[PDB]
Design a protein around this ligand. Structure first.
Ligand code: SF4
Ligand SMILES: [Mg+2]
Ligand SMILES: [Zn+2]
Lengths: 358, 381, 160
RNA sequence: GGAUACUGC
DNA sequence: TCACGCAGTATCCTGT
């Protein structure tokens, strides 16, 4: 606590509930944003490459946190100025990234996932004392049943949960729920009821903490997306936030090629007409869509191809999503009866709707 | 008691004995919720078995009037609906829904017939009533400890058994699924007349089952070994032998040929089972099959269920459906319960205090204490 | 949905500063979301009304067309029949059938009666409120489909 | 391609 | 025995 510090950052881990109120510099803003983007990308890469419980995951994540200077380990010394600085970093950077990662549902999900992962890791590095401190500072009030009450009903809990060993039970913490929510458990008598509350089992505690965290974070992201117009007017922060996600820290094209050789003459004619006029009557649309589904063009790929081909036909871009998107989805059994419609057979094509002029 | 005398006595009782004030206090639940008493369903059974439902009333005066006018033989209380039942014809289809009702249990001696030896069908005697005495303790304890229901009124059914009304506000808002869950949690003896072994406990005894067995044990020696004498002769102890694995059956039979008292036979059976370990719970399964309450899940599952009203008159025994004090349960005697004829003789032997001069008074007192507790809970909350 | 849109219009056509307008809109939408999630909205507000051009039987899509389905059910019941020109009111509910919304229509009374049918909150928040509001907010700067969905509790993913 | 709705002016 | 015109937006489906 050198010059302008306080009790604003008691513990390392936090739920990121209260937005920062300070006036920071543009350079600090950019540095914090990029640094936390690096941290989250490292988290994502390590999660893809390794199992999150693996020791390699822990070692690499600790190395990244040390390299970028983020709080990851506790310190039973006091709130040293340096430590304070680090925590401040974390707190501001998080919210900055919120502003960056609230525009699109995809982005939101990504952000949430990475944040949860990081939080889990940090919890995994908390000593029991520190853990309790955290659980108190946020009014979580887990002693979730207390330890004393657990000892009070030790035998009842032991006989309630199937296949729970004495010591293993000592290593587990239960939760108190109104019995109206545990119907499926109470009905076959696999959870103890006391005074209208069931004692439901979950290492597991982190899970509950994370659940709470996730709830909060989702809500926050929604609110941020609701408060976006106020930020877009700040040109200084627009290039960063609008593009942070893209910050450095079968193919459609080959379809034409296939049309040269592999496509049967029917599909060759349809493709030639499509590229000549960028529009097909209903029969052609159905036939060609089913064929491109057959070759393997995925729903996203087919949607992209049809969008690009039709947009050149002097029609509104929104019109495509309004009209033809449902047809494209249906060909892949996505809507309606939701049936994986098979590609037309030659017998059907011969005996299907007879083509006419145009 | 002469049932041809029923039509003579019913009016007087409904005029000068039926406790309407406390009845309205009960079903009105302190007026907190508007239209609560006004949306309650009643049903009446009149002379010559004429049944009417969707009866609702505006207040105590209307109820007293229409009841004294109809003189029904049976009164059943039903659910509290979304609208007044009297106007159910006026409510648009699908918009007439049962919304709240007490959680109720019906325990009927007839359901114990395959396991009692003193009586059968609708006959009861002092030797079998202990079963009800067990049930009330086994169930009510659960309802007070596992579920936390605080306002529980136990009522004699008039002949074959007892009803329980659980009236906590939480218990009145329970959905159908929650009610079915509660019933299944409390229910152990599962099966019909075609099954012999109706209890199969797992290796782990759920605390509830442990506490039910603890309650059973206190009474078991008197009920089963002294009174019922479930091991009196071969025709009966063959059943209990039929309830245990064949391996020791022969070993038991010879032993049962040398025992003079069923208490001795129980000691021998317990010793033999202990000697024989996964079967260490078999005696508990036998005790439960002879002592644990049987619950008709259909009675308690449905919200729209019409159950016998307290202070009704039993069409055959004439006894009054009187509340049972939980503390004095061990002293309860279903044969001393006032009949309608006795209380009309008492009435014609001497305004709002007439019932205090009959033998009905202590039961109305228990009901008044229960309603006082409900009022305290409504206020304190 | 209609009411929601009306509120939005009252906010858009007023003289309040645009930012405040947007804020208010958000608030209202969130309120609606909560009112749906807790099931507090009156059942009467969940009804959709549609008229029949032909008799119930003439339609060859008795399954795909919801209102027709409801009409058929009514004609199967023991009351006055519904004929061409008679409007029918239906609600979309959940039954565990895992079918498309168009096949899950039900008469309001039926919902109040059966113990397996519950209002399909999701649907009403996803295809009734959100579309309308979006189409009312298209030319207004600061409000886009995504945002609206977010405010309702829906997933904003599928929306040199 | 088709089917079902109901607004406008 | 019947029944006003046309322009426009929104939603949904295509197995035997
Ligand atoms: S419909 Fe069949 S036979 Fe005719 S051109 Fe296409 S692949 Fe060949
Ligand atoms: Mg067209
Ligand atoms: Zn008996």
């Amino acid at each position: 606590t050198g010059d302008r510090k306080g009790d604003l950052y008691p513990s390392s881990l936090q739920f990121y509930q209260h937005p920062p109120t300070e006036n920071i510099s543009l350079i600090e803003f950019e540095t914090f944003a990029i640094e936390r983007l690096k941290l989250l990308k490292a988290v994502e890469n390590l999660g893809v490459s390794y199992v999150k419980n693996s020791e390699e995951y822990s070692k690499k994540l600790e190395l990244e946190l040390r390299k970028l200077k983020f709080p990851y380990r506790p310190l039973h010394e006091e709130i040293s100025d340096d430590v304070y600085d680090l925590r401040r970093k974390d707190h501001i950077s998080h919210f900055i990234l919120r502003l960056a990662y609230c525009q699109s549902e995809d982005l939101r999900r990504w952000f949430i996932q990475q944040e949860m992962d990081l939080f889990k890791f940090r919890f995994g590095l908390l000593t029991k004392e520190s853990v309790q401190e955290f659980l108190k500072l946020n009014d979580l009030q887990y002693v979730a049943i207390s330890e004393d009450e657990k000892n009070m009903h030790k035998e009842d809990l032991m006989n309630s949960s199937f296949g729970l060993s004495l010591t293993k039970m000592e290593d587990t913490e239960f939760y108190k729920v109104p019995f109206q929510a545990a119907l499926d458990l109470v009905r076959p008598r696999k959870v103890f009821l006391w005074r209208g509350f069931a004692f439901i089992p979950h290492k597991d505690i982190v899970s509950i903490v994370l659940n709470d965290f996730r709830a909060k974070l989702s809500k926050a992201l929604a609110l941020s997306a609701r408060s976006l117009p106020v930020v877009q007017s700040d040109e200084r922060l627009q290039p960063l936030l609008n593009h942070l996600s893209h910050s450095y820290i079968i193919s459609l094209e080959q379809i034409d090629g296939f049309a040269a050789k592999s496509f049967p003459l029917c599909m060759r004619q349809l493709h030639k007409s499509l590229r000549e006029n960028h529009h097909l009557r209903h029969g052609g649309r159905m036939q060609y869509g089913l064929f491109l589904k057959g070759i393997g063009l995925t729903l996203e790929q087919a949607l992209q191809f049809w969008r690009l081909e039709f947009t050149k036909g002097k029609v509104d871009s929104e019109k495509f999503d309004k009209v033809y998107a449902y047809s494209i989805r249906h060909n892949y059994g996505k809507e309606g009866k939701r049936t994986d419609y098979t590609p037309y057979s030659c017998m059907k094509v011969i005996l299907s709707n007879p083509p006419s002029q145009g | 008691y002469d049932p041809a005398s029923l039509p003579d006595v019913l009016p007087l009782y409904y005029r000068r004995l039926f406790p309407f004030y406390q009845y309205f206090r009960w079903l009105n639940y302190g007026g907190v919720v508007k239209n609560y008493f006004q949306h309650r369903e009643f049903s009446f059974t009149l002379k010559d078995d004429v049944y009417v439902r969707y009866q609702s009333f505006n207040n105590q005066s209307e109820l007293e009037k229409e009841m004294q006018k109809m003189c029904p033989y049976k009164i059943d209380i039903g659910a509290v609906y979304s609208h007044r039942p009297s106007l159910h014809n006026t409510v648009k289809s699908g918009t007439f829904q049962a919304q709240e009702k007490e959680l109720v249990f019906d325990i009927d001696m007839t359901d114990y017939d395959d396991v009692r030896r003193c009586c059968s069908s609708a006959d009861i005697c002092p030797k079998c009533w202990t079963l009800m005495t067990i049930a009330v303790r086994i169930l009510d304890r659960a309802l007070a400890e596992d579920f936390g229901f605080k306002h529980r009124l136990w009522v004699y059914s008039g002949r074959r058994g007892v009803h329980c009304w659980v009236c906590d506000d939480s218990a009145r808002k329970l959905s159908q699924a929650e009610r079915s869950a509660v019933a299944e949690y409390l229910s152990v003896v599962k099966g019909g007349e075609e099954t012999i072994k109706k209890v199969q406990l797992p290796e782990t005894i759920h605390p509830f089952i442990g506490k039910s067995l603890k309650m059973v044990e206190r009474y078991f020696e008197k009920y089963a070994l002294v009174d019922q004498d479930i091991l009196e002769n071969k025709q009966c102890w063959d059943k209990v032998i039929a309830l245990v694995p064949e391996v020791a059956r022969e070993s038991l039979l010879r032993e049962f040929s040398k025992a003079r008292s069923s208490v001795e036979r129980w000691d021998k059976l317990s010793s033999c089972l202990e000697a024989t370990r996964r079967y260490s719970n078999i005696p508990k399964e036998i005790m439960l099959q002879f002592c644990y309450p049987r619950l008709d899940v259909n009675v308690s599952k449905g919200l729209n269920h019409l159950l016998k009203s307290p202070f009704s008159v039993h069409p055959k025994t004439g006894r009054i459906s009187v509340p049972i004090d939980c503390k004095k349960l061990d002293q309860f005697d279903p044969f001393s319960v006032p009949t309608i004829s006795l209380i009309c003789s008492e009435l014609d032997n001497v305004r709002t205090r007439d019932y205090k001069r009959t033998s009905l008074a202590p039961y109305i007192k228990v009901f008044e204490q229960f309603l006082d507790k409900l009022d305290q809970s409504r206020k304190g909350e | 949905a209609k009411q929601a849109g009306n509120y939005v219009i009252s906010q858009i056509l007023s003289d309040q500063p645009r930012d405040s307008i947007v804020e208010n809109i958000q608030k209202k939408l969130t309120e609606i979301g909560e009112n749906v999630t807790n099931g507090t909205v009156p059942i009467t507000q969940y009804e959709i009304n549609k008229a029949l051009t032909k008799d119930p039987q003439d339609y060859p899509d008795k399954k795909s067309l919801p209102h027709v389905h409801v009409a058929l059910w009514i004609n199967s019941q023991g009351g006055r029949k519904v004929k061409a020109g008679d409007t029918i009111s239906y609600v979309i509910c959940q039954d565990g059938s895992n079918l498309s919304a168009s096949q899950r229509a039900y008469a309001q009374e039926q919902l109040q009666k059966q113990e397996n049918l519950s209002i399909d909150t999701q649907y009403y928040l996803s295809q009734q409120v959100h579309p309308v509001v979006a189409r009312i907010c298209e030319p207004i700067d600061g409000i886009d489909s995504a945002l609206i969905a977010m405010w309702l509790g829906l997933d904003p993913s599928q929306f040199r």
